[PDB]
């Protein structure tokens, strides 16, 4: 039934089965010492502390939040989301998790896996246009109770009142990507994937999205340190 499952598993992608549907889930771990551009992910802890000690009212204030509450979130689209990526920073590590829609008609499985795990009220984002949340028809209570709470932009909107992520990476964060698959190619790659279901078509897209969510961490740190200096 589900094709290329062995090939997907080598890439760290496994299926999540739900209600006669499925989605594909990838998980990568990084050490807290990992440097992504100028900053190691361990500097997040410092900026969350400084925010909690700050009397400054700001859209990016982490006052009242712990570092684990923040979901660094980025999506790819085809117009609707087909890839949900997020990173989360814990005491020993950073976890990147990606939920891939294998084709239209699997949205219940996608939302069941994503909404089970992500606090959609605490997203850190860099999205210019409002999120194109996929449409879904379900009885399930977890999903229905969230559809109208699905935000246009993250709570921590890194683009607030304000430029491409690539340009910020190079000019501000000191991040250089090797042989990146650009976001504007994801639609065409995904369109061909729907038919052929060959993992090779999306491995580059999945790496790009992974690099996206890590850069959101580096950007949040960068912007916070500028503010709290
Ligand atoms: Mg992206």
Author numbering: 34 to 111, 119 to 202, 213 to 279
Tell me, in the authors' exact words, what the paper reports.
The MrfB exonuclease core was purified and initial sparse matrix screens were set with the addition of MgCl2 and dTMP, which would represent the nucleotide product of the exonuclease reaction. The structure was solved by molecular replacement with the AlphaFold model for residues 33–279 as a search model. Two molecules of MrfB were present in the asymmetric unit. The dimeric status in the crystal likely arises from crystal packing as the exonuclease core eluted as a monomer on gel filtration. Density was observed for residues 34–111, 119–202 and 213–279. There was no density observed for dTMP, and only one Mg2+ (site A) was observed at the active site, coordinated by residues Asp107, Glu109 and Asp262. Furthermore, a predicted α-helix from residues 171–183 was in a random coil, which resulted in Asp172 being displaced away from the active site and unable to coordinate a Mg2+ ion in the B site. In the AlphaFold model, Phe171 is poised to base stack with the DNA, and in our structure is instead flipped into a hydrophobic pocket. Instead, we propose this conformation protects hydrophobic residues of MrfB from solvent when it is not engaged with DNA, and it becomes activated upon DNA binding.
Mitomycin C (MMC) repair factor A (mrfA) and factor B (mrfB), encode a conserved helicase and exonuclease that repair DNA damage in the soil-dwelling bacterium Bacillus subtilis.
